[PDB]
RNA sequence: ACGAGACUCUGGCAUGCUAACUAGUUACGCGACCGGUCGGCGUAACUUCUUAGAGGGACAAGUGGCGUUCAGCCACCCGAGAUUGAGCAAUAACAGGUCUGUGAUGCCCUUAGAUGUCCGGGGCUGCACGCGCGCUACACUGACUGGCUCAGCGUGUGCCUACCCUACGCCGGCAGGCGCGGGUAACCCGUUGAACCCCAUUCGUGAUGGGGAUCGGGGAUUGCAAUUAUUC
């Protein structure tokens, strides 16, 4: 199938942007037409906990946070070229999922 | 304009006095078994005008209102609308009204006290029966 | 309170003493000059330094400055 | 017999059926997102997990 | 000939599509004198009342509004309509007419053209809201 | 001219459509209309005693505006504040049976039909009826 | 057969606080006096190019009453990102 | 042609107090259709003097907890009682409100002793802004407790309160409180 | 202290409702209720009846406030 | 030099850039009603609206006063904004709290009719009374009953681990029940049809239709058990 969608998830923005730019550059050096990086809304995981290990003192809370950023790339290519582009030693921490539509 | 035909300022129904100035469906609420919803359903199925006050209805209207109040299931009032559904002893669905019916059926606490159930014991001791804390609440009338 | 910290003031004084020829009375040219000749890791700090440089240029315009 | 009695009480929903995956305690447990750790263990391992303080 | 200029208040945002037409003003498909509270109807009519029907006579305006609260959707609609007329006049008529309409609108109300930046403040622990604190006892 | 639902007042449109439905005499009403409460968060029965026709008119108008609704959607439309006594108030949904019977009565008038994606929608006959009633409302005291 | 484990060396041991903490731990476990071990770890960290460092040891250092003992050198920031 | 609501002009309103002319905003830049403008008059000191007097009254009406933030209700309560002031007096309601503001503001009152003290009070003069603020507060309070536990609706209590204050009558709560404050200031002179 | 308002008119109070209320500058259910010792519901009904007969002019109507004035 | 500031996150502005069938908007076709209304259908433009990256943008910078004419303060113009809110936070100290968070712990105590551990049943709520945090009120600027119309933050099917969010259809006042689907989620719930508020209605100044404690009789739901009454 010529419809290939790459989903990129990461907790670090800089790594995700570097990987997306590298992937699109590789897909454009080859004569492939690629739909640009669609940026899904960021998911913010929140946990609020009491600071103390006990129940004593002024009630203070830690507000922890995790942020998940999601990118989508659609390209028209045979699967072999997609495999060539994907395996380019991507930056650690970025999860890449290639799906056939 | 007040009705000349002896506008009943005070009306006696079930050994209770209802006020003729009160709008119907709220005047008959004074009966100790009838409140708001029961009154409205009774008057709807008795087909009387709800905008009238209790003093402008005739004797026949009040009579049929009393009968439909005392025989709800005979006029297609649903069984879930009553306050004595599946009554213990005689498993009859009914609506208990006023002195002699509501307060006497209230005197089913003696059943609980005779079997010495925990709820009956809490009733006998004047305490609270529905599992509420008694530390810091209800301290009125307990010296 | 718009009181500048010693970081801003010493940075501005050194910048002025070193590059007085390139500077003037314009904030928007001074900030470009500062970002070209200096390494200020923040944009807000750069803007504060450029603003104080403009103030000091106006001050030297009508005489001397102790710094 | 003891075989049918030992640990025979149902443990499927209450606090007796959940515990910290680190310290095996049963109090102050965080079930959100599948962490299944108590509050103190979470404060201890939050940076390793990836939860960092921003605001 | 169209502009699509929009305006906001709190979370409510309204986009006004203004094209060459014959004086139609609708909000979410309903005519202007039908918006909900109807106590602030004059707040909606302020642009056309200030500028006159003659200036809106050559345009059709259709406003799509979504976001938080009746009283914000109002003020968002009026901001969008004012800015849409200003932009249409600037792009398709001249700078002088734009100047006069902008002067009238700004003199009457700055919020007709420039959005209010105020937003809800966060809640901090230790109190029911942004700055209120729970009762302290000794 | 030409008048639709969206260029007339919705309250008097609802009143006119309810009058039309009652006058038609083809809408089947349940036998418990004079006993039910319309919501758990209600305290009394409706005051009108013709409330079924008004509710049918409201439901038909809603299906006109945003089609594809079913029970649950209409139950959420007619939900409201529930006062829990000495407890704080909370949102509460409307009666499911009244919404289901209103929708089932609107069909059979050939004004409402099931939609493919699940739910209810207005039939072209229903759209025409609502638009004619809207034209009547507009030609009425709305503007003479 | 899918998981596998390498093992590499730290570029600069003197600049890894976990490594220095382990070194101090196993120095104290070896009977070395607290001050000698702390000062040695401090000096090794400073000689490795660190801009500054701080070693704190707390507990029953001398006697039945606990106390804390701090060794600092160079520059050390505390606030901000 | 910017009549309030859609019926009350401002061209005929005369403040005629000189002292409060700069602090009652009703006339030309402060002629608006509605007493509801969002507005940011509390951001900087003295700006509330640019707020129209009808909006100041409307804001002062939202009081005693249960009515906090309900400004649409209060603009309705002003629209009514303007419709009622016109019926009762035959004059422009804006003129009646302005006259009430003039009449109900204290001119002197007492503070704690002078430079310092903890025994008695010393008389001092009132700022025009504080005059207008206190007038609005007193008029609103008088209306509020006239309508409480009474079949007389609000927008009737407020209308009669404003009418009495415009007349200077002692049937007004605001006039009584103003006289009380002024007399106490007189005694502590 | 406790006021005792009527719920329906008597001939004396139905009088002084047909030749003085139509002369008030302001006619309101609360005003008529206080000046005729009648309940709010009766006052509203009487004012609606007077307006139906053309003796009263409606100035404004609202769910919370209805205002009438004399026909002059 | 540390702390303050700087810093990071966050709120406001960009018709400028990058670019989107898991967001749309215009336009054009095809339909449904009386040019208009279409969260009716479909496909070009494109990115204002939506997302989220880069960069820009504000500095007391401009003007006028006050100041040693300095550091700065006040006011005004232009401006999206002329003080957004948090996070982190020094030296040093407390016999502050926590051994009941820990396979963190030193010393004691106990260790087999056990202070280990399961398993029944009680308790932790028990009520003359005192004291904190609170919820609902004392109404008419309100209750009731219909009608109308607007959000945002976010959470959804699990290592063990049983337990998810729910559209639509039907049955039942109701609480619920029964079938059928979607969703591991900008894809489904959902266009989150929130409440107050708005509009109309009835009440009519009194413990009143305010207010809902207490208590009786029925019906369901979750659970292995609901009585001391889980909840509805
Ligand atoms: Mg800081
Ligand atoms: Zn743990």
From Swiss-Prot, chain C:
It comes from the Eukaryota. The modification N6-succinyllysine is found at residue 18. It is found in: Cytoplasm; Nucleus, Nucleolus. Component of the small ribosomal subunit. Part of the small subunit (SSU) processome, composed of more than 70 proteins and the RNA chaperone small nucleolar RNA (snoRNA) U3. It is linked to Diamond-Blackfan anemia 4: A form of Diamond-Blackfan anemia, a congenital non-regenerative hypoplastic anemia that usually presents early in infancy. Diamond-Blackfan anemia is characterized by a moderate to severe macrocytic anemia, erythroblastopenia, and an increased risk of developing leukemia. 30 to 40% of Diamond-Blackfan anemia patients present with short stature and congenital anomalies, the most frequent being craniofacial (Pierre-Robin syndrome and cleft palate), thumb and urogenital anomalies. Belongs to the eukaryotic ribosomal protein eS17 family. This is Small ribosomal subunit protein eS17. The chain holds residues 2 to 68 of 135 of the full protein.
Curated annotation (Swiss-Prot), chain E:
Coiled coil: none annotated. One of its GO terms (biological process) is cytoplasmic translation. It holds the Pfam family Ribosomal_S9. It comes from the Eukaryota. One of its GO terms (molecular function) is structural constituent of ribosome. Component of the small ribosomal subunit. The ribosome is a large ribonucleoprotein complex responsible for the synthesis of proteins in the cell. Part of the small subunit (SSU) processome, first precursor of the small eukaryotic ribosomal subunit. During the assembly of the SSU processome in the nucleolus, many ribosome biogenesis factors, an RNA chaperone and ribosomal proteins associate with the nascent pre-rRNA and work in concert to generate RNA folding, modifications, rearrangements and cleavage as well as targeted degradation of pre-ribosomal RNA by the RNA exosome. SUPFAM superfamilies: Ribosomal protein S5 domain 2-like. Its main location: cytoplasm. It is found in: Cytoplasm; Nucleus, Nucleolus. Belongs to the universal ribosomal protein uS9 family. The keyword Repeat does not apply. This is Small ribosomal subunit protein uS9. It comes from Homo sapiens (Human). Component of the small ribosomal subunit. Part of the small subunit (SSU) processome, composed of more than 70 proteins and the RNA chaperone small nucleolar RNA (snoRNA) U3. Keywords: Acetylation, Cytoplasm, Nucleus, Phosphoprotein, Ribonucleoprotein, Ribosomal protein. The modification N6-acetyllysine is found at residue 53.
Curated annotation (Swiss-Prot), chain F:
InterPro entries: Ribosomal_eS19 (IPR001266), Ribosomal_eS19_CS (IPR018277), WH-like_DNA-bd_sf (IPR036388), WH_DNA-bd_sf (IPR036390). SMART domains: Ribosomal_S19e. Keywords: Acetylation, Cytoplasm, Diamond-Blackfan anemia, Disease variant, Host-virus interaction, Methylation, Nucleus, Ribonucleoprotein, Ribosomal protein. Changing residue 17 to P: In DBA1; affects protein stability; does not localize to the nucleolus; affects assembly into a functional ribosomal subunit. The modification N6-acetyllysine is found at residues 22, 110, 114. Changing residue 61 to W: In DBA1; increased protein degradation; affects assembly into a functional ribosomal subunit. One of its GO terms (biological process) is ribosomal small subunit biogenesis. It comes from the Eukaryota. GO terms for cellular component: cytoplasm; cytosol; cytosolic ribosome; cytosolic small ribosomal subunit; extracellular exosome; focal adhesion; membrane; nucleolus. It holds the Pfam family Ribosomal_S19e. Changing residue 55 to Q: In DBA1; affects assembly into a functional ribosomal subunit. It comes from Homo sapiens. Its main location: cytoplasm. The modification N6-succinyllysine is found at residue 142. Gene3D superfamilies: Winged helix-like DNA-binding domain superfamily/Winged helix DNA-binding domain (1.10.10.10). It is found in: Cytoplasm; Nucleus, Nucleolus. The modification Omega-N-methylarginine is found at residue 66. The keyword Ribonucleoprotein applies. GO terms for molecular function: fibroblast growth factor binding; identical protein binding; protein kinase binding; RNA binding; structural constituent of ribosome. The keyword Isomerase does not apply. This is Small ribosomal subunit protein eS19.
From Swiss-Prot, chain G:
The modification Phosphoserine is found at residue 23. Methylation by PRMT1 is required for import into the nucleolus and for ribosome assembly. Component of the 40S small ribosomal subunit. Identified in a IGF2BP1-dependent mRNP granule complex containing untranslated mRNAs. Interacts with HNRPD. Interacts with PRMT1; the interaction methylates RPS3. Interacts with SUMO1; the interaction sumoylates RPS3. Interacts with UBC9. Interacts with CDK1; the interaction phosphorylates RPS3. Interacts with PRKCD; the interaction phosphorylates RPS3. Interacts with PKB/AKT; the interaction phosphorylates RPS3. It comes from Homo sapiens. Changing residue 51 to A: Does not affect ability to cleave DNA but abolishes binding to 8-oxoG. The lineage of its organism: Eukaryota, Metazoa, Chordata, Craniata, Vertebrata. Belongs to the universal ribosomal protein uS3 family. The modification N6-succinyllysine is found at residue 51. This is Small ribosomal subunit protein uS3. The chain holds residues 82 to 162 of 243 of the full protein. Transmembrane segments: none annotated. Changing residue 68 to A: No effect on phosphorylation by PRKCD. There is a cross-link at residue 9 (Glycyl lysine isopeptide (Lys-Gly) (interchain with G-Cter in ubiquitin)). It comes from the Eukaryota. It is found in: Cytoplasm; Nucleus; Nucleus, Nucleolus; Mitochondrion inner membrane.
């Amino acid at each position: 199938i010529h419809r290939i969608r790459i989903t990129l998830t990461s907790r670090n923005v800089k790594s995700l942007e570097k990987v997306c730019a590298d992937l699109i550059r590789g897909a454009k050096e080859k004569n492939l037409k690629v739909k640009g990086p669609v940026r899904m809304p960021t998911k913010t995981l929140r946990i609020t906990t009491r600071k103390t290990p006990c129940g004593e003192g002024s009630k203070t809370w830690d507000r922890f946070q995790m942020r998940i950023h999601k990118r989508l790339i659609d390209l028209h290519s045979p699967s072999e070229i997609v495999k060539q582009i994907t395996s380019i030693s991507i930056e650690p921490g970025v999860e890449v999922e290639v799906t056939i539509a | 304009l007040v009705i000349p035909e002896k506008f009943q300022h005070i009306l006696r129904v079930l050994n209770t006095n209802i006020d003729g100035r009160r709008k119907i469906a709220f005047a008959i609420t004074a009966i100790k078994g009838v409140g708001r919803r029961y009154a409205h359903v009774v008057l709807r199925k008795a087909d009387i005008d709800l905008t009238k006050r209790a003093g402008e209805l005739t004797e026949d209207e009040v009579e049929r209102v009393i009968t439909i109040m005392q025989n709800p299931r005979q006029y297609k009032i649903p069984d879930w609308f009553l306050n004595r559904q599946k009554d213990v002893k005689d498993g009859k669905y009914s609506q208990v009204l006023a002195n002699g019916l509501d307060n006497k059926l209230r005197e089913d606490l003696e059943r609980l006290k005779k079997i010495r159930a925990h709820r009956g014991l809490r009733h006998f001791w004047g305490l609270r029966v529905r599992g509420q804390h008694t530390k810091t609440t209800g301290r009125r009338g307990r010296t | 309170g718009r009181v500048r910290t010693k970081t801003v003031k010493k940075a501005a004084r050194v910048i002025i003493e070193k590059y007085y020829t390139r500077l003037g009375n314009d904030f928007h040219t001074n900030k470009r000059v500062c970002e070209e000749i200096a390494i200020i890791p923040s944009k807000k700090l750069r803007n504060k330094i450029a603003g104080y440089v403009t103030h000091l240029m106006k001050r030297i315009q009508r005489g001397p400055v102790r710094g | 017999g003891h075989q049918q009695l030992y640990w025979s009480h149902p443990r499927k929903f209450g606090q007796g059926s959940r515990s910290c995956r680190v310290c095996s305690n049963r109090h102050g447990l965080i079930r959100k997102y599948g962490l299944n750790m108590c509050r103190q263990c979470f404060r201890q391992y939050a940076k390793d997990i990836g939860f960092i303080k921003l605001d | 000939q169209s502009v699509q200029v929009f305006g906001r208040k709190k979370t409510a945002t309204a986009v006004a599509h203004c094209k060459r037409g014959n004086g139609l003003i609708k909000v979410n498909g309903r005519p202007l004198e039908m918006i909900e509270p109807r106590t602030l109807q004059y707040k909606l009519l302020e642009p056309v009342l200030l500028l006159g029907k003659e200036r809106f006579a050559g345009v059709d305006i259709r406003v799509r509004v979504k976001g938080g609260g009746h009283v914000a959707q109002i003020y968002a609609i009026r901001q969008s309509i004012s800015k849409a007329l200003v932009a249409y006049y600037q792009k398709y008529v001249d700078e002088a007419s734009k100047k006069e309409i902008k002067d009238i609108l700004i003199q009457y109300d700055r919020t007709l053209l420039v959005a209010d930046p105020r937003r809800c403040e966060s809640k901090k622990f230790g109190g029911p809201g942004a700055r209120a604190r729970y009762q302290k006892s000794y | 001219p030409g008048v639709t639902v969206k260029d007339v007042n919705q309250q008097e449109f609802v009143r006119a459509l309810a009058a039309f439905l009652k006058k038609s005499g083809k809408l089947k009403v349940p036998e418990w209309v004079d006993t039910v409460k319309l919501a758990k968060h209600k305290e009394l029965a409706p005051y009108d005693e013709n409330w079924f026709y008004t509710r049918a008119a409201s439901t038909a108008r809603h299906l006109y505006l945003r089609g594809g609704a079913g029970v649950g959607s209409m139950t959420k439309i007619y939900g409201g504040r529930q006062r829990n006594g000495v407890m704080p108030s909370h949102f509460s949904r409307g009666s499911k049976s009244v919404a289901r019977r209103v929708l089932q009565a609107l069909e059979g008038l050939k004004m409402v039909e099931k939609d493919q994606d699940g739910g209810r929608k207005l039939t072209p006959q229903g759209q025409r009826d609502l638009d004619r009633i809207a034209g009547q409302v507009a030609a009425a005291n709305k503007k003479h | 057969g899918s998981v596998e484990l390498y093992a590499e060396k730290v570029a600069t041991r003197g600049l890894c606080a976990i490594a220095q903490a382990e070194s101090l731990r196993y120095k104290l476990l070896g009977g070395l006096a607290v001050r000698r071990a702390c000062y040695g770890v401090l000096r090794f960290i400073m000689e490795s190019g660190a801009k500054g460092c701080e070693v704190v040891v707390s507990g029953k250092l001398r006697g039945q009453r606990a106390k804390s003992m701090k060794f600092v050198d160079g520059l050390m920031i505390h606030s901000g990102d | 042609d910017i009549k309030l609501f859609g019926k009350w002009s401002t061209d005929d309103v005369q403040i005629n107090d000189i002292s409060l002319q700069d602090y009652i905003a009703v006339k030309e830049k402060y002629a608006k259709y509605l007493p509801h403008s969002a507005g940011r008059y509390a951001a900087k000191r003295f700006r509330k003097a640019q707020c129209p007097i009808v909006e100041r009254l409307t804001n002062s009406m939202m009081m005693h907890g249960r009515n906090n933030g309900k400004k649409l209700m209060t603009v309705r309560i002003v629209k009514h009682a303007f419709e009622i002031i016109h019926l009762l007096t035959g004059e422009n309601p804006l003129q009646v409100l302005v006259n009430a503001i003039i009449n109900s503001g204290p001119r002197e009152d007492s503070t704690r002793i002078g430079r310092a003290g903890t025994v008695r009070r010393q008389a001092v003069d009132v700022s025009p802004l504080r005059r207008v603020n206190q007038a609005i507060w007193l008029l609103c309070t008088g209306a509020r407790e006239a309508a409480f536990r009474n079949i007389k609706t609000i927008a009737e209590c407020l209308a009669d309160e404003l009418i009495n204050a415009a007349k200077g009558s002692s049937n007004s709560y605001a006039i009584k409180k103003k006289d009380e404050l002024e007399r106490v200031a007189k005694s502590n002179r | 202290d406790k006021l005792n308002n009527l719920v329906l008119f008597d001939k004396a109070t139905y009088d002084k409702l047909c030749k003085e209320v139509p002369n008030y500058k302001l006619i309101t259910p609360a005003v008529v209720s206080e000046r005729l010792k009648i309940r709010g519901s009766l006052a509203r009904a009487a004012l609606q009846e007077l307006l139906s007969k053309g003796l009263i002019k409606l100035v404004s109507k609202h769910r919370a406030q209805v205002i009438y004035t004399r026909n002059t």
